[PDB]
Design a binder for this molecule. Structure first.
Ligand SMILES: O=c1cc(C(F)(F)F)[nH]c2nc(NCc3ccc(-c4ccccc4)cc3)nn12
Ligand SMILES: [Zn+2]
Length: 356
């Protein structure tokens, strides 16, 4: 039944590529926000994580929902790992010029996120206040990241996440992660780990001024140069279905979350979990011939199958930090993962009614 999957991918491709003023409205707003933040002492070097691509989408099915990252480089920071969480960190400074521009957000040794955010959110509030032309509103909701959600017009939503950028070596918790060696090669892994890493404000539970590692730039680089062969998806004789399988996994989850948004059992699942499981299947199946365009149906099924295995065993290691179990029962409880298991098996056994 790979014929249905192709049609699903065609609709999704058409929706995304259809002419839209959305990206241009959000560019206008983001560009005003950046200039106004660049005028303030603490945010002088703030900039876009992806330049030219204001249109990063979390929900592959929601074209009016945008997700942007404002990065700010911090030199010579000291990370202290928080509570053996492996992913969450206190941000200290080596502070050899003690007058670092973020000195105003200090609480002794420790960089305060809630303070940085409240000022970030206040500068942003002061520019969405001075909006010319089109109308935009700030929907300030809980959670440190995204910092704010902007609503433009009736349909457009922009999540803005603030991120510290570190150009030093990745924390030890990543040392055994990104296990792409038998897929993208050991030399690519080394290249990637020379790239910076990011830290976004975040709490482990739902108290403390912690930051969480973010590697969305590495995920993007992998997806756009994803084959074992350097020529994967350039020709037609080596055209693969890796990106299609990811889009199908994302769209399955988004459709099931929408189908059950009144029951809450699926609220903790996100794109992270499907992207992570996908990349694990990329390591398991490193050959481009295991992702043949013609095998879209079988390839999708391996992804669904592996995702179901993660759910039932309650194990899904973060791709960058192998000791962080995304499916631990402290993050998602057994009944929630068992609920999702049942719905996906119902989809697979009825030829995915969410793809009708
Ligand atoms: O940008 C990307 C892309 C991917 C991938 F594409 F592979 F999925 N994994 C990835 N891990 C990180 N940072 C570490 C980290 C991030 C998130 C959480 C978390 C925990 C609980 C709930 C929700 C999230 C824990 C640790 N960044 N990052
Ligand atoms: Zn490919």
């Amino acid at each position: 039944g790979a014929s249905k999957l192709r049609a699903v991918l065609e609709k999704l491709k058409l929706s995304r590529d259809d002419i839209s003023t959305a990206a241009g409205m959000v560019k206008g707003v983001v560009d005003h926000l950046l200039l106004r933040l660049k005028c303030d002492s603490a945010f002088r070097g703030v900039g876009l994580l992806n330049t030219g691509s204001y249109y990063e989408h979390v929900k592959i099915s929601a074209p009016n929902e945008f997700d942007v990252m404002f990065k700010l480089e911090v030199p010579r920071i000291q990370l202290e790992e928080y509570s053996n969480t492996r992913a969450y960190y206190f941000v200290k400074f080596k502070r050899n010029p003690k007058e670092n521009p973020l000195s105003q957000f200090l609480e002794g040794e420790i960089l305060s996120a809630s303070k940085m955010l409240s000022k970030f959110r206040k500068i942003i509030k002061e520019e969405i206040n001075d909006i010319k032309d089109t109308d935009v509103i700030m929907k300030r909701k809980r959670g440190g990241s995204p910092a704010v959600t902007l609503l433009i017009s009736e349909k457009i939503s922009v999540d803005i996440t603030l991120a510290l950028e570190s150009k030093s070596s990745w924390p030890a918790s990543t040392q055994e992660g990104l296990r792409i060696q038998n897929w993208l090669s050991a030399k690519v892994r080394k290249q990637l780990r020379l790239k910076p890493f990011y830290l976004v404000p975040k709490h482990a539970k739902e108290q403390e001024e912690t930051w969480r590692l973010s590697f969305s730039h590495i995920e993007k680089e992998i997806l756009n140069n994803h084959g074992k062969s350097k020529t994967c998806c350039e020709n037609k004789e080596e055209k693969c279905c890796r990106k299609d399988c990811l889009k199908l996994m994302k769209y399955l989850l988004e459709q099931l979350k929408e189908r059950f948004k009144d029951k809450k059992h699926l609220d903790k699942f996100s794109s992270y979990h499907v992207k992570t499981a996908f990349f694990h299947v990329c390591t398991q199946n490193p050959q481009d011939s295991q992702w043949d365009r013609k095998d879209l149906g079988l390839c999708f099924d391996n992804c669904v199958t592996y995702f179901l295995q993660c759910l039932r065993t309650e194990k899904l290691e973060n791709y960058f930090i192998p000791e962080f179990n995304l499916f631990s029962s402290n993050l998602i409880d057994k009944r929630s993962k068992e609920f999702l298991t049942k719905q996906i098996e119902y989809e697979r056994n009825n030829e995915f009614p969410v793809f009708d």
